[PDB]
Structure 1
Amino acid sequence: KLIGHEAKLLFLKSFQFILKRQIRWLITEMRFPKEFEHVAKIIWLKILKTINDQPQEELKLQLHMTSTISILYLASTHLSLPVYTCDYIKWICTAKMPYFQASEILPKSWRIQLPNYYVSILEGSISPFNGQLYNKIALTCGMIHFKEFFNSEISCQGLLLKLV
Protein backbone atom coordinates (compact mmCIF):
# COMPACT_ATOMS: atom_id res chain seq x y z
CA LYS A 1 0.00 0.00 0.00
CA LEU A 2 2.38 2.69 -1.26
CA ILE A 3 1.81 5.45 -3.81
CA GLY A 4 4.28 7.59 -5.73
CA HIS A 5 8.08 7.38 -5.81
CA GLU A 6 8.64 4.56 -3.32
CA ALA A 7 5.64 2.60 -4.62
CA LYS A 8 7.57 2.83 -7.88
CA LEU A 9 10.82 1.79 -6.22
CA LEU A 10 9.48 -1.66 -5.29
CA PHE A 11 7.36 -1.97 -8.44
CA LEU A 12 10.90 -1.43 -9.73
CA LYS A 13 12.24 -4.02 -7.29
CA SER A 14 9.62 -6.66 -8.06
CA PHE A 15 10.32 -6.20 -11.77
CA GLN A 16 13.92 -6.66 -10.67
CA PHE A 17 13.07 -9.95 -8.95
CA ILE A 18 11.01 -11.85 -11.53
CA LEU A 19 13.48 -11.16 -14.33
CA LYS A 20 16.17 -12.76 -12.17
CA ARG A 21 13.92 -15.77 -11.57
CA GLN A 22 13.35 -15.78 -15.32
CA ILE A 23 17.09 -15.87 -16.01
CA ARG A 24 17.97 -18.82 -13.79
CA TRP A 25 15.35 -21.11 -15.28
CA LEU A 26 17.05 -19.75 -18.38
CA ILE A 27 20.32 -21.33 -17.28
CA THR A 28 18.76 -24.61 -16.19
CA GLU A 29 16.96 -24.98 -19.49
CA MET A 30 19.95 -23.95 -21.66
CA ARG A 31 22.97 -24.49 -19.35
CA PHE A 32 24.91 -21.53 -20.76
CA PRO A 33 27.25 -20.81 -17.76
CA LYS A 34 28.20 -17.66 -15.87
CA GLU A 35 28.13 -16.02 -19.30
CA PHE A 36 24.31 -16.02 -19.83
CA GLU A 37 23.74 -14.95 -16.24
CA HIS A 38 26.09 -12.00 -15.94
CA VAL A 39 25.42 -10.41 -19.33
CA ALA A 40 21.74 -10.42 -18.41
CA LYS A 41 22.47 -8.75 -15.08
CA ILE A 42 24.44 -5.76 -16.44
CA ILE A 43 21.94 -5.43 -19.27
CA TRP A 44 19.32 -4.50 -16.68
CA LEU A 45 21.95 -2.68 -14.63
CA LYS A 46 22.26 -0.65 -17.83
CA ILE A 47 18.47 -0.42 -18.05
CA LEU A 48 18.29 0.76 -14.44
CA LYS A 49 20.90 3.44 -15.10
CA THR A 50 18.51 5.44 -17.28
CA ILE A 51 15.50 4.94 -15.00
CA ASN A 52 17.28 6.76 -12.17
CA ASP A 53 18.17 9.76 -14.36
CA GLN A 54 14.67 10.75 -15.49
CA PRO A 55 13.50 10.04 -11.88
CA GLN A 56 12.42 13.15 -9.89
CA GLU A 57 8.93 11.78 -10.28
CA GLU A 58 9.41 9.97 -13.57
CA LEU A 59 7.02 7.05 -13.72
CA LYS A 60 7.33 6.08 -17.36
CA LEU A 61 9.37 2.97 -16.52
CA GLN A 62 7.12 0.25 -15.09
CA LEU A 63 8.11 -2.20 -17.83
CA HIS A 64 5.52 -4.17 -19.81
CA MET A 65 4.99 -7.95 -19.68
CA THR A 66 7.10 -7.98 -22.85
CA SER A 67 10.03 -5.79 -21.66
CA THR A 68 11.44 -8.66 -19.59
CA ILE A 69 11.69 -11.13 -22.46
CA SER A 70 12.99 -8.37 -24.74
CA ILE A 71 15.73 -8.01 -22.13
CA LEU A 72 16.47 -11.72 -22.07
CA TYR A 73 16.17 -11.72 -25.85
CA LEU A 74 18.64 -8.87 -26.20
CA ALA A 75 21.08 -10.56 -23.84
CA SER A 76 20.78 -13.91 -25.59
CA THR A 77 21.38 -12.18 -28.92
CA HIS A 78 24.58 -10.92 -27.33
CA LEU A 79 25.41 -14.53 -26.58
CA SER A 80 23.58 -15.34 -29.80
CA LEU A 81 22.40 -18.67 -28.40
CA PRO A 82 18.94 -18.96 -30.13
CA VAL A 83 15.88 -17.42 -31.87
CA TYR A 84 12.66 -15.54 -30.95
CA THR A 85 9.69 -17.54 -32.21
CA CYS A 86 11.26 -20.75 -31.05
CA ASP A 87 12.01 -19.23 -27.69
CA TYR A 88 8.54 -17.84 -27.37
CA ILE A 89 6.79 -21.06 -28.33
CA LYS A 90 8.99 -23.12 -26.07
CA TRP A 91 8.42 -20.76 -23.22
CA ILE A 92 4.65 -20.79 -23.58
CA CYS A 93 4.48 -24.52 -24.04
CA THR A 94 6.44 -25.37 -20.94
CA ALA A 95 5.60 -22.19 -19.01
CA LYS A 96 9.36 -22.14 -18.82
CA MET A 97 9.10 -18.46 -17.97
CA PRO A 98 7.42 -17.23 -14.80
CA TYR A 99 6.30 -14.61 -17.29
CA PHE A 100 2.61 -15.54 -17.33
CA GLN A 101 1.71 -14.96 -13.67
CA ALA A 102 3.32 -12.44 -11.32
CA SER A 103 2.36 -14.11 -8.04
CA GLU A 104 5.69 -15.81 -7.61
CA ILE A 105 8.01 -12.99 -6.67
CA LEU A 106 8.94 -13.84 -3.13
CA PRO A 107 6.27 -11.26 -2.83
CA LYS A 108 3.38 -12.64 -0.84
CA SER A 109 4.35 -9.19 0.52
CA TRP A 110 5.28 -7.33 -2.67
CA ARG A 111 1.82 -8.49 -3.69
CA ILE A 112 0.32 -6.58 -0.77
CA GLN A 113 2.88 -3.84 -1.40
CA LEU A 114 -0.53 -2.85 -2.63
CA PRO A 115 -0.29 -2.09 -6.36
CA ASN A 116 0.54 1.66 -6.43
CA TYR A 117 0.01 2.34 -10.15
CA TYR A 118 2.19 -0.78 -10.31
CA VAL A 119 2.84 -4.24 -8.81
CA SER A 120 -0.67 -5.45 -9.61
CA ILE A 121 -0.14 -4.60 -13.28
CA LEU A 122 2.94 -6.86 -13.19
CA GLU A 123 3.06 -10.58 -14.01
CA GLY A 124 0.66 -12.03 -16.58
CA SER A 125 -1.53 -9.25 -17.97
CA ILE A 126 -1.92 -10.36 -21.62
CA SER A 127 -0.52 -12.18 -24.69
CA PRO A 128 1.38 -10.24 -27.42
CA PHE A 129 -0.16 -8.58 -30.48
CA ASN A 130 1.56 -8.21 -33.89
CA GLY A 131 4.98 -6.55 -33.71
CA GLN A 132 4.03 -5.36 -30.25
CA LEU A 133 6.38 -8.20 -29.35
CA TYR A 134 9.29 -6.07 -30.53
CA ASN A 135 7.51 -2.72 -30.49
CA LYS A 136 9.56 -2.72 -27.31
CA ILE A 137 12.63 -4.75 -28.22
CA ALA A 138 13.40 -1.70 -30.35
CA LEU A 139 12.56 0.60 -27.45
CA THR A 140 14.85 -1.40 -25.17
CA CYS A 141 17.58 -1.10 -27.79
CA GLY A 142 16.68 2.58 -27.66
CA MET A 143 17.03 2.66 -23.89
CA ILE A 144 20.04 0.38 -24.14
CA HIS A 145 21.94 1.71 -27.12
CA PHE A 146 22.30 -2.09 -27.45
CA LYS A 147 23.79 -2.35 -30.90
CA GLU A 148 26.90 -0.38 -29.93
CA PHE A 149 27.22 -2.39 -26.72
CA PHE A 150 26.61 -5.89 -28.04
CA ASN A 151 27.98 -7.86 -30.96
CA SER A 152 26.23 -9.63 -33.85
CA GLU A 153 22.58 -8.68 -33.28
CA ILE A 154 19.80 -10.76 -34.79
CA SER A 155 21.76 -13.32 -36.81
CA CYS A 156 21.65 -17.01 -36.30
CA GLN A 157 22.17 -19.41 -39.17
CA GLY A 158 20.25 -21.46 -36.64
CA LEU A 159 16.92 -19.74 -37.31
CA LEU A 160 17.29 -20.78 -40.94
CA LEU A 161 17.92 -24.37 -39.84
CA LYS A 162 14.99 -24.24 -37.42
CA LEU A 163 12.89 -23.02 -40.34
CA VAL A 164 13.84 -25.56 -43.03
Structure 2
Amino acid sequence: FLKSFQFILKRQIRWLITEMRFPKEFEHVAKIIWLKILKTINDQPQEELKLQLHMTSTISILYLASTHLSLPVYTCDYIKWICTAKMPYFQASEILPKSWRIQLPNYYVSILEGSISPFNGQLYNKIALTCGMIHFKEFFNSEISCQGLLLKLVMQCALPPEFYFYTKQVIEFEETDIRNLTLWERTDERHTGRVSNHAELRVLSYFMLTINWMLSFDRDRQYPLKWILSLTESLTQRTTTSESIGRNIVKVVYPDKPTSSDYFQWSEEETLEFLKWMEKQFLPTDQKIARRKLYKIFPLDREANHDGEFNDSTHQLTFIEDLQERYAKQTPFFPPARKEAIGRLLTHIASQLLVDFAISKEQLKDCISRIKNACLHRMN
Protein backbone atom coordinates (compact mmCIF):
# COMPACT_ATOMS: atom_id res chain seq x y z
CA PHE A 1 0.00 0.00 0.00
CA LEU A 2 2.82 2.39 0.92
CA LYS A 3 4.52 1.79 -2.42
CA SER A 4 1.45 2.97 -4.32
CA PHE A 5 0.24 5.65 -1.89
CA GLN A 6 3.65 7.25 -2.34
CA PHE A 7 3.35 6.66 -6.10
CA ILE A 8 0.11 8.65 -6.18
CA LEU A 9 1.58 11.28 -3.82
CA LYS A 10 4.36 11.58 -6.40
CA ARG A 11 1.87 12.14 -9.23
CA GLN A 12 0.08 14.89 -7.30
CA ILE A 13 3.28 16.86 -6.63
CA ARG A 14 4.59 16.29 -10.16
CA TRP A 15 1.35 17.83 -11.42
CA LEU A 16 1.80 20.93 -9.26
CA ILE A 17 5.35 21.83 -10.29
CA THR A 18 4.86 21.06 -13.99
CA GLU A 19 1.62 22.99 -14.41
CA MET A 20 0.75 25.24 -11.46
CA ARG A 21 4.21 26.93 -11.42
CA PHE A 22 5.36 25.44 -8.11
CA PRO A 23 9.09 25.64 -7.29
CA LYS A 24 11.13 22.46 -7.52
CA GLU A 25 12.02 22.38 -3.81
CA PHE A 26 8.36 21.74 -2.95
CA GLU A 27 8.99 18.04 -3.61
CA HIS A 28 12.05 18.21 -1.36
CA VAL A 29 10.06 19.66 1.55
CA ALA A 30 7.36 17.05 1.01
CA LYS A 31 9.66 14.03 1.31
CA ILE A 32 10.78 14.73 4.90
CA ILE A 33 7.09 15.08 5.78
CA TRP A 34 6.48 11.78 3.98
CA LEU A 35 9.54 10.06 5.46
CA LYS A 36 8.80 10.94 9.08
CA ILE A 37 5.23 9.70 8.38
CA LEU A 38 6.88 6.33 7.54
CA LYS A 39 8.87 6.35 10.80
CA THR A 40 5.60 6.57 12.74
CA ILE A 41 4.57 3.50 10.68
CA ASN A 42 7.99 2.00 11.60
CA ASP A 43 7.56 2.55 15.36
CA GLN A 44 4.36 0.52 15.54
CA PRO A 45 4.65 -3.25 16.24
CA GLN A 46 4.54 -4.85 12.77
CA GLU A 47 2.10 -7.55 13.83
CA GLU A 48 -1.33 -5.86 13.52
CA LEU A 49 0.00 -2.32 13.18
CA LYS A 50 -3.03 -0.73 11.46
CA LEU A 51 -1.32 2.39 9.96
CA GLN A 52 -4.01 5.09 9.42
CA LEU A 53 -3.98 6.38 5.93
CA HIS A 54 -6.66 7.81 3.59
CA MET A 55 -6.75 9.95 0.42
CA THR A 56 -7.39 12.75 2.89
CA SER A 57 -3.88 12.02 4.19
CA THR A 58 -2.18 12.76 0.87
CA ILE A 59 -3.89 16.15 0.90
CA SER A 60 -2.91 16.92 4.51
CA ILE A 61 0.79 16.26 3.97
CA LEU A 62 0.58 18.27 0.76
CA TYR A 63 -0.92 21.17 2.70
CA LEU A 64 1.84 21.08 5.32
CA ALA A 65 4.49 21.11 2.60
CA SER A 66 2.82 24.24 1.19
CA THR A 67 2.39 26.10 4.49
CA HIS A 68 5.94 25.39 5.61
CA LEU A 69 6.88 26.90 2.26
CA SER A 70 4.38 29.65 3.31
CA LEU A 71 2.20 29.79 0.21
CA PRO A 72 -1.18 31.53 -0.30
CA VAL A 73 -2.66 28.17 -1.37
CA TYR A 74 -5.18 26.53 0.96
CA THR A 75 -7.90 23.92 1.25
CA CYS A 76 -9.98 26.54 -0.55
CA ASP A 77 -7.52 25.93 -3.40
CA TYR A 78 -7.24 22.20 -2.77
CA ILE A 79 -10.89 21.19 -2.74
CA LYS A 80 -11.31 23.26 -5.92
CA TRP A 81 -8.35 21.47 -7.50
CA ILE A 82 -9.62 17.97 -6.70
CA CYS A 83 -13.37 18.32 -7.32
CA THR A 84 -12.49 19.72 -10.74
CA ALA A 85 -10.34 16.57 -11.21
CA LYS A 86 -7.05 18.38 -11.81
CA MET A 87 -4.66 16.54 -9.54
CA PRO A 88 -5.16 12.75 -9.22
CA TYR A 89 -7.28 12.53 -6.07
CA PHE A 90 -10.46 10.83 -7.44
CA GLN A 91 -10.02 7.43 -9.12
CA ALA A 92 -6.29 7.51 -8.47
CA SER A 93 -6.21 3.71 -8.30
CA GLU A 94 -7.87 3.24 -11.68
CA ILE A 95 -5.18 4.95 -13.75
CA LEU A 96 -1.86 5.19 -11.96
CA PRO A 97 -0.22 1.94 -10.63
CA LYS A 98 -1.01 -0.52 -13.51
CA SER A 99 0.89 -3.46 -11.97
CA TRP A 100 0.52 -3.09 -8.17
CA ARG A 101 -3.25 -2.63 -8.70
CA ILE A 102 -3.93 -6.39 -9.39
CA GLN A 103 -2.08 -7.65 -6.22
CA LEU A 104 -3.56 -4.97 -3.86
CA PRO A 105 -6.59 -6.14 -1.73
CA ASN A 106 -10.27 -5.13 -2.27
CA TYR A 107 -10.19 -2.66 0.70
CA TYR A 108 -6.74 -1.09 -0.01
CA VAL A 109 -7.68 -0.50 -3.70
CA SER A 110 -10.94 1.17 -2.53
CA ILE A 111 -9.16 3.49 -0.02
CA LEU A 112 -6.83 4.78 -2.82
CA GLU A 113 -9.60 5.84 -5.20
CA GLY A 114 -11.15 8.85 -3.38
CA SER A 115 -14.81 7.96 -3.88
CA ILE A 116 -16.23 10.67 -1.55
CA SER A 117 -14.62 14.15 -1.20
CA PRO A 118 -13.73 15.43 2.36
CA PHE A 119 -16.71 16.92 4.15
CA ASN A 120 -17.73 18.51 7.44
CA GLY A 121 -14.14 19.47 8.18
CA GLN A 122 -12.77 16.00 7.38
CA LEU A 123 -9.71 17.58 5.77
CA TYR A 124 -8.90 19.70 8.82
CA ASN A 125 -9.03 16.72 11.18
CA LYS A 126 -6.59 14.76 9.03
CA ILE A 127 -4.10 17.62 9.35
CA ALA A 128 -4.63 17.35 13.12
CA LEU A 129 -3.72 13.68 13.01
CA THR A 130 -0.80 14.57 10.67
CA CYS A 131 0.45 17.28 13.02
CA GLY A 132 0.17 14.74 15.85
CA MET A 133 1.99 11.73 14.43
CA ILE A 134 4.83 13.85 13.06
CA HIS A 135 5.49 17.16 14.78
CA PHE A 136 4.81 19.88 12.24
CA LYS A 137 4.91 22.02 15.36
CA GLU A 138 8.41 22.66 16.84
CA PHE A 139 10.12 21.63 13.56
CA PHE A 140 8.35 23.68 10.87
CA ASN A 141 6.92 27.19 10.80
CA SER A 142 3.26 26.46 11.62
CA GLU A 143 2.35 30.00 10.59
CA ILE A 144 -0.58 30.31 8.20
CA SER A 145 0.00 33.10 5.70
CA CYS A 146 -3.27 34.77 6.67
CA GLN A 147 -2.49 37.84 4.57
CA GLY A 148 -2.63 35.77 1.38
CA LEU A 149 -5.87 34.21 2.61
CA LEU A 150 -8.00 37.33 2.94
CA LEU A 151 -6.82 38.90 -0.32
CA LYS A 152 -8.61 36.04 -2.04
CA LEU A 153 -11.53 36.63 0.35
CA VAL A 154 -11.48 40.33 -0.58
CA MET A 155 -11.58 39.62 -4.31
CA GLN A 156 -14.03 36.73 -3.87
CA CYS A 157 -17.15 38.84 -3.33
CA ALA A 158 -15.95 42.24 -4.66
CA LEU A 159 -15.89 44.10 -1.38
CA PRO A 160 -13.93 47.40 -0.93
CA PRO A 161 -10.27 46.93 0.05
CA GLU A 162 -10.83 48.91 3.26
CA PHE A 163 -12.18 45.68 4.74
CA TYR A 164 -8.78 44.04 4.32
CA PHE A 165 -7.47 46.35 7.04
CA TYR A 166 -10.77 46.55 8.88
CA THR A 167 -10.37 42.80 9.36
CA LYS A 168 -6.75 42.59 10.48
CA GLN A 169 -7.21 45.07 13.32
CA VAL A 170 -10.06 42.86 14.53
CA ILE A 171 -7.72 39.87 14.13
CA GLU A 172 -4.89 41.71 15.90
CA PHE A 173 -7.12 42.78 18.79
CA GLU A 174 -8.56 39.30 19.41
CA GLU A 175 -5.45 37.07 18.99
CA THR A 176 -2.68 35.35 21.08
CA ASP A 177 0.62 37.45 21.05
CA ILE A 178 -1.03 39.77 18.36
CA ARG A 179 0.31 37.80 15.27
CA ASN A 180 0.83 34.06 14.68
CA LEU A 181 -2.45 32.29 13.95
CA THR A 182 -0.59 29.10 14.72
CA LEU A 183 -1.53 25.80 13.13
CA TRP A 184 -2.83 23.26 15.64
CA GLU A 185 -1.54 19.78 16.44
CA ARG A 186 -3.41 16.76 17.80
CA THR A 187 -1.35 13.85 19.06
CA ASP A 188 -3.99 13.43 21.72
CA GLU A 189 -6.88 11.12 20.74
CA ARG A 190 -9.98 10.38 18.34
CA HIS A 191 -11.55 13.56 19.85
CA THR A 192 -12.03 16.38 17.30
CA GLY A 193 -11.36 19.71 19.05
CA ARG A 194 -14.56 21.78 18.86
CA VAL A 195 -12.60 24.85 19.96
CA SER A 196 -12.06 25.80 16.29
CA ASN A 197 -8.39 25.14 16.96
CA HIS A 198 -7.64 25.08 13.23
CA ALA A 199 -5.83 28.28 12.29
CA GLU A 200 -7.39 28.47 8.83
CA LEU A 201 -10.82 28.01 10.44
CA ARG A 202 -10.25 30.95 12.80
CA VAL A 203 -9.63 33.51 10.04
CA LEU A 204 -13.05 32.87 8.49
CA SER A 205 -14.92 33.62 11.71
CA TYR A 206 -12.97 36.87 12.09
CA PHE A 207 -13.98 37.74 8.51
CA MET A 208 -17.62 37.10 9.40
CA LEU A 209 -17.66 39.33 12.49
CA THR A 210 -15.76 42.04 10.61
CA ILE A 211 -18.20 42.31 7.69
CA ASN A 212 -21.09 42.47 10.14
CA TRP A 213 -19.72 45.17 12.44
CA MET A 214 -18.26 47.55 9.85
CA LEU A 215 -21.69 47.90 8.19
CA SER A 216 -24.04 47.55 11.17
CA PHE A 217 -22.27 50.09 13.40
CA ASP A 218 -21.88 52.76 10.72
CA ARG A 219 -22.55 56.07 12.45
CA ASP A 220 -20.43 57.75 9.73
CA ARG A 221 -23.31 57.27 7.13
CA GLN A 222 -20.63 55.87 4.81
CA TYR A 223 -22.06 52.48 3.75
CA PRO A 224 -25.68 53.15 2.73
CA LEU A 225 -28.55 50.69 2.49
CA LYS A 226 -28.95 51.05 -1.28
CA TRP A 227 -25.31 50.02 -1.68
CA ILE A 228 -26.27 46.68 -0.11
CA LEU A 229 -29.07 46.43 -2.68
CA SER A 230 -26.34 47.00 -5.29
CA LEU A 231 -24.08 44.34 -3.70
CA THR A 232 -26.32 41.50 -2.48
CA GLU A 233 -28.07 41.72 -5.84
CA SER A 234 -24.60 41.87 -7.41
CA LEU A 235 -23.07 38.96 -5.50
CA THR A 236 -26.10 36.69 -5.94
CA GLN A 237 -25.41 36.50 -9.66
CA ARG A 238 -24.10 33.84 -12.03
CA THR A 239 -21.12 34.28 -14.34
CA THR A 240 -19.00 32.05 -16.54
CA THR A 241 -15.50 32.46 -15.16
CA SER A 242 -13.32 29.44 -14.49
CA GLU A 243 -13.55 30.18 -10.77
CA SER A 244 -17.35 30.41 -10.93
CA ILE A 245 -17.85 27.29 -13.04
CA GLY A 246 -15.28 25.48 -10.92
CA ARG A 247 -17.22 26.55 -7.83
CA ASN A 248 -20.33 25.09 -9.47
CA ILE A 249 -18.56 21.72 -9.55
CA VAL A 250 -17.98 21.81 -5.80
CA LYS A 251 -21.64 22.65 -5.25
CA VAL A 252 -22.46 19.47 -7.18
CA VAL A 253 -20.20 17.11 -5.22
CA TYR A 254 -21.58 17.93 -1.76
CA PRO A 255 -25.13 16.58 -1.25
CA ASP A 256 -25.66 17.28 2.45
CA LYS A 257 -26.00 21.04 2.40
CA PRO A 258 -28.57 22.95 0.37
CA THR A 259 -27.55 24.90 -2.75
CA SER A 260 -26.59 21.48 -4.12
CA SER A 261 -29.53 21.25 -6.51
CA ASP A 262 -28.36 24.57 -7.91
CA TYR A 263 -28.06 23.18 -11.45
CA PHE A 264 -31.74 23.99 -11.95
CA GLN A 265 -30.71 27.66 -11.77
CA TRP A 266 -27.96 27.29 -14.38
CA SER A 267 -28.01 29.06 -17.72
CA GLU A 268 -27.38 28.15 -21.35
CA GLU A 269 -23.67 28.88 -21.74
CA GLU A 270 -22.78 27.87 -18.18
CA THR A 271 -24.03 24.38 -19.03
CA LEU A 272 -21.84 24.01 -22.15
CA GLU A 273 -18.63 24.73 -20.26
CA PHE A 274 -19.64 22.14 -17.68
CA LEU A 275 -19.78 19.67 -20.56
CA LYS A 276 -16.39 20.83 -21.77
CA TRP A 277 -15.17 20.13 -18.26
CA MET A 278 -16.62 16.63 -18.72
CA GLU A 279 -13.71 15.92 -21.09
CA LYS A 280 -11.54 16.17 -17.94
CA GLN A 281 -13.51 13.55 -15.98
CA PHE A 282 -13.38 10.48 -18.26
CA LEU A 283 -9.63 10.77 -18.73
CA PRO A 284 -9.24 10.37 -14.93
CA THR A 285 -12.32 8.19 -14.55
CA ASP A 286 -15.03 -9.24 -26.96
CA GLN A 287 -18.17 -7.11 -26.31
CA LYS A 288 -16.16 -3.92 -26.76
CA ILE A 289 -17.58 -3.97 -30.28
CA ALA A 290 -20.99 -3.06 -28.87
CA ARG A 291 -19.73 0.09 -27.17
CA ARG A 292 -17.51 0.93 -30.15
CA LYS A 293 -20.57 0.79 -32.38
CA LEU A 294 -22.59 2.98 -30.03
CA TYR A 295 -19.80 5.52 -29.67
CA LYS A 296 -19.91 5.79 -33.45
CA ILE A 297 -23.63 6.51 -33.34
CA PHE A 298 -23.06 9.00 -30.48
CA PRO A 299 -19.81 10.80 -31.32
CA LEU A 300 -18.75 12.73 -28.25
CA ASP A 301 -18.18 16.00 -30.09
CA ARG A 302 -20.91 18.01 -31.75
CA GLU A 303 -22.24 16.54 -35.00
CA ALA A 304 -20.80 19.54 -36.93
CA ASN A 305 -19.74 23.18 -36.39
CA HIS A 306 -17.79 22.63 -33.19
CA ASP A 307 -16.03 25.27 -31.08
CA GLY A 308 -12.44 24.16 -31.66
CA GLU A 309 -10.97 25.70 -34.83
CA PHE A 310 -12.77 28.95 -35.73
CA ASN A 311 -14.97 30.01 -32.82
CA ASP A 312 -14.60 33.63 -31.76
CA SER A 313 -12.24 36.25 -30.50
CA THR A 314 -13.44 35.73 -26.90
CA HIS A 315 -16.31 33.97 -25.18
CA GLN A 316 -15.07 33.33 -21.63
CA LEU A 317 -13.80 36.17 -19.46
CA THR A 318 -11.38 35.64 -16.58
CA PHE A 319 -11.29 36.39 -12.84
CA ILE A 320 -9.51 39.73 -13.30
CA GLU A 321 -12.29 40.98 -15.58
CA ASP A 322 -15.60 40.15 -13.91
CA LEU A 323 -14.56 42.23 -10.89
CA GLN A 324 -14.15 45.12 -13.33
CA GLU A 325 -17.88 44.67 -13.92
CA ARG A 326 -18.72 44.05 -10.24
CA TYR A 327 -17.00 47.14 -8.87
CA ALA A 328 -18.46 49.11 -11.81
CA LYS A 329 -21.93 47.96 -10.71
CA GLN A 330 -21.85 49.31 -7.13
CA THR A 331 -21.09 52.88 -8.27
CA PRO A 332 -23.16 54.87 -5.68
CA PHE A 333 -21.23 55.31 -2.45
CA PHE A 334 -22.29 58.67 -1.03
CA PRO A 335 -33.15 51.84 11.39
CA PRO A 336 -35.59 48.92 10.92
CA ALA A 337 -35.09 48.23 7.20
CA ARG A 338 -31.30 48.61 7.28
CA LYS A 339 -30.65 45.58 9.49
CA GLU A 340 -33.00 43.45 7.39
CA ALA A 341 -30.87 43.71 4.23
CA ILE A 342 -27.73 43.17 6.29
CA GLY A 343 -29.14 39.69 6.83
CA ARG A 344 -29.48 39.27 3.06
CA LEU A 345 -25.77 39.84 2.44
CA LEU A 346 -24.49 37.92 5.46
CA THR A 347 -26.29 34.64 4.82
CA HIS A 348 -25.10 34.68 1.20
CA ILE A 349 -21.43 35.28 1.94
CA ALA A 350 -21.76 32.55 4.58
CA SER A 351 -23.30 30.03 2.17
CA GLN A 352 -20.71 30.64 -0.56
CA LEU A 353 -17.94 30.13 2.03
CA LEU A 354 -19.10 26.75 3.39
CA VAL A 355 -18.81 25.17 -0.07
CA ASP A 356 -15.18 26.26 -0.46
CA PHE A 357 -13.99 24.93 2.91
CA ALA A 358 -16.00 21.69 3.18
CA ILE A 359 -17.50 22.37 6.61
CA SER A 360 -21.12 22.31 7.70
CA LYS A 361 -23.03 25.20 9.21
CA GLU A 362 -22.91 23.52 12.64
CA GLN A 363 -19.15 23.36 12.09
CA LEU A 364 -19.35 27.15 11.63
CA LYS A 365 -22.13 28.09 14.08
CA ASP A 366 -19.74 26.83 16.74
CA CYS A 367 -16.83 28.74 15.18
CA ILE A 368 -18.73 32.03 15.38
CA SER A 369 -19.79 31.40 18.98
CA ARG A 370 -16.31 30.46 20.20
CA ILE A 371 -14.99 33.65 18.57
CA LYS A 372 -17.80 36.09 19.42
CA ASN A 373 -17.98 35.05 23.08
CA ALA A 374 -14.22 35.34 23.50
CA CYS A 375 -13.91 38.75 21.84
CA LEU A 376 -16.35 40.81 23.91
CA HIS A 377 -14.57 39.27 26.94
CA ARG A 378 -11.66 41.67 26.28
CA MET A 379 -13.61 44.66 27.58
CA ASN A 380 -15.49 42.49 30.09
After superposition, the Cα gap between the structure-2 partners of 1:132 and 1:106, relative to the gap in structure 1 and judged at 3 Å, is: closer
Whether contact under 8 Å (1:103, 1:123) holds in the other structure is: yes
Count of matched residue pairs: 154
Structure-to-structure mapping, 1:24-43, within 5 angstroms = 24-43=14-33
Higher relative helix content: 1
After superposition, the Cα gap between the structure-2 partners of 1:42 and 1:150, relative to the gap in structure 1 and judged at 3 Å, is: same
Whether contact under 8 Å (1:80, 1:156) holds in the other structure is: no
- Displacement of 1:29 in angstroms is 3.0
Please tell me whether Structure 1 or Structure 2 has the larger radius of gyration of its CA atoms: 2
- Displacement of 1:116 in angstroms is 6.0
After superposition, the Cα gap between the structure-2 partners of 1:57 and 1:153, relative to the gap in structure 1 and judged at 3 Å, is: farther
After superposition, the Cα gap between the structure-2 partners of 1:116 and 1:155, relative to the gap in structure 1 and judged at 3 Å, is: same
- How far, CA to CA, are the matches of 1:62 and 1:117 in structure 2? 13
Whether contact under 8 Å (1:47, 1:143) holds in the other structure is: yes
- How far, CA to CA, are the matches of 1:152 and 1:135 in structure 2? 16
Of 76-85 and 101-110, more deviation after overlay is shown by 101-110
TM-score (norm 1): 0.83
- How far, CA to CA, are the matches of 2:104 and 2:79 in structure 1? 32
- Secondary structure of the equivalent of 2:130? helix
Whether contact under 8 Å (2:136, 2:142) holds in the other structure is: no
After superposition, the Cα gap between the structure-2 partners of 1:12 and 1:89, relative to the gap in structure 1 and judged at 3 Å, is: closer
Greater relative contact order structure (CA < 8 Å, 6+ sep): 1
Of 74-83 and 146-155, more deviation after overlay is shown by 146-155
Whether contact under 8 Å (2:72, 2:149) holds in the other structure is: yes
- Secondary structure of the equivalent of 1:33? coil
- How far, CA to CA, are the matches of 2:121 and 2:48 in structure 1? 26
Of 72-81 and 31-40, more deviation after overlay is shown by 31-40
1:89 to 79, 100, 104: 79
Of 87-96 and 142-151, more deviation after overlay is shown by 87-96
Whether contact under 8 Å (2:93, 2:109) holds in the other structure is: no
After superposition, the Cα gap between the structure-2 partners of 1:108 and 1:78, relative to the gap in structure 1 and judged at 3 Å, is: same
- How far, CA to CA, are the matches of 1:159 and 1:27 in structure 2? 21
Whether contact under 8 Å (1:18, 1:105) holds in the other structure is: no
Per-residue displacement from partner, 1:91-119 (whole Å, max 9, x unpaired)?
13542210111235642221111316423
Whether contact under 8 Å (1:111, 1:120) holds in the other structure is: no
- Secondary structure of the equivalent of 1:148? coil
- How far, CA to CA, are the matches of 2:108 and 2:133 in structure 1? 20
Whether contact under 8 Å (1:98, 1:104) holds in the other structure is: no
Whether contact under 8 Å (1:65, 1:126) holds in the other structure is: no
Structure 2's unaligned 5+ residue stretches are 155-380
- How far, CA to CA, are the matches of 1:40 and 1:58 in structure 2? 27
Of 126-135 and 98-107, more deviation after overlay is shown by 98-107
- Secondary structure of the equivalent of 1:58? coil
- Secondary structure of the equivalent of 2:113? coil
Q: How large is the RMSD of aligned CA atoms in angstroms?
A: 1.9
Whether contact under 8 Å (2:71, 2:145) holds in the other structure is: no
Moved over 3 A (4+): none
TM-score (norm 2): 0.38
After superposition, the Cα gap between the structure-2 partners of 1:59 and 1:85, relative to the gap in structure 1 and judged at 3 Å, is: same
Whether contact under 8 Å (2:91, 2:113) holds in the other structure is: yes
Of 124-133 and 39-48, more deviation after overlay is shown by 124-133
Whether contact under 8 Å (2:93, 2:101) holds in the other structure is: yes
After superposition, the Cα gap between the structure-2 partners of 1:130 and 1:110, relative to the gap in structure 1 and judged at 3 Å, is: same
- Secondary structure of the equivalent of 1:127? coil
Of 100-109 and 151-160, more deviation after overlay is shown by 100-109
After superposition, the Cα gap between the structure-2 partners of 1:125 and 1:99, relative to the gap in structure 1 and judged at 3 Å, is: same
Partner of 1:65: 55
- Displacement of 1:64 in angstroms is 0.9
Whether contact under 8 Å (2:41, 2:51) holds in the other structure is: yes
Of 21-30 and 117-126, more deviation after overlay is shown by 117-126
Whether contact under 8 Å (2:67, 2:142) holds in the other structure is: yes
- Secondary structure of the equivalent of 1:95? coil
Per-residue displacement from partner, 1:110-157 (whole Å, max 9, x unpaired)?
111131642332122211121111111010000111011111432331
